[PDB]
């Protein structure tokens, strides 16, 4: 996505909370930014546009912009704000409206939990079949929204990544998976591979290497 | 909602489907309508603005509008067209972007595919940390509904099992993962552990062993 939003932004009731939306000079750096809110699967509604507060929305919501990063601040987080928030703007470089991935804003009803990250190399059984897959297990995190990035050696992998939608497990925390399909030629040629998981203020990165 | 959309619409592969967006004179009747596609609660993409086709969106998407009702027509439904579609415009009585409730498009008759199962033994990084985790990667299956059962040697295992709800990946197929938490001594005390995946009455099972 041309616009980058954080995965999860949470806090207790009455807490000052801030979302961000990062792009480039051809979208956020020169065009107004709108923020839309969607609860469950209900109808989305505009809650901020061009740093201007729409009629009917409370003034706890405030929008600002500095360079290529727009922000939505919620001064006094309340339970009725628990929703997904999407930012969007016009992208003159592509001549189309452009929308970010969305941020899940959660009112904490349970302790915030950073995720456990376990990186699995390709088993010898799979490589004996001329196949290679790496799995990055993301477990026991709340709220259920994370950002995953992969690195070949120390350079990012810009293709081949598949990350599952977080799902709630039996302990009421969330779990997800991110797998990367390779060939035996790449797994041996590279010195290491990395999976990086971002959950609010916590970022965990695991690294594995061929035997 | 100020904009009215049908809740859900279905159609087989190759059918022509038309979604409608109903509004007012101060919003739909006066201003261009944009259509936005959201998948797997992923980043949404605009598929039609002002009845004109953006770049990269195939020709099968066409837009029309007459009076206070705008329409998006999708000829030749494909698996990747299956999504939620939202329409939005500018309202003039109010001064806001307004969004409809969305239309869930379900593409029928998509090809079936058995899941590819990959069972990962506990990594060396976590065995040295006195941990043990088996991960059963399930991918490339349609439809998106599996049932996972584990085995220690030949005995069923339930305690320590968590399975992710399937989610659609970039190939329009589903992916999930089930993980079993063990201690390092359970892991070597047994001959093997197994992960059985059942999809559409047919079973795929994998088996791993220590070191
Ligand atoms: Br702005």
Numbering used by the authors:
A (entry chain B), B (entry chain A): 2 to 212
What's the paper's own text on this?
LCs were distributed in two groups: a set of eight amyloidogenic LCs responsible for severe cardiac involvement and symptoms in patients (hereafter, H LC), and a set of five non amyloidogenic LCs isolated from patients affected by multiple myeloma for which no amyloid aggregation or proteotoxicity was observed in patients (hereafter, M LC). Five H LCs (H3, H6, H7, H9 and H10) and two M LCs (M7 and M8) were successfully crystallized and their 3D-structures solved. CL domains (res 115–214) are typically characterized by high quality electron density, are all very well superposable, and the dimeric CL–CL arrangement is clearly conserved in all the analysed structures (root mean square deviations -r.m.s.d.- generally fall below 1.0 Å over the entire CL–CL dimer - Table S3A and Fig. 4B-bottom).
(ii) All the selected LCs were of the λ isotype, which is overrepresented among amyloidogenic LCs (approximately 75%), all the H LCs (except H10 from germline 1–36) belong to germlines commonly found among AL patients. At the protein concentration required for Near-UV experiments four LCs (H10, M2, M8, M10) precipitated before the unfolding process was complete, thus Tmapp could not be determined. These are however divided into two subsets: H3, H6 H7, H9 and H16 are very efficiently proteolysed, while H10, H15 and H18 show slower cleavage kinetics. In some cases (H6, H9, H10) CDR3 (residues 89–97) participates in the interface; both CDR3s in the H7 dimer lack electron density, while in M7 and M8 CDR3 residues are located far from the VL–VL interface.
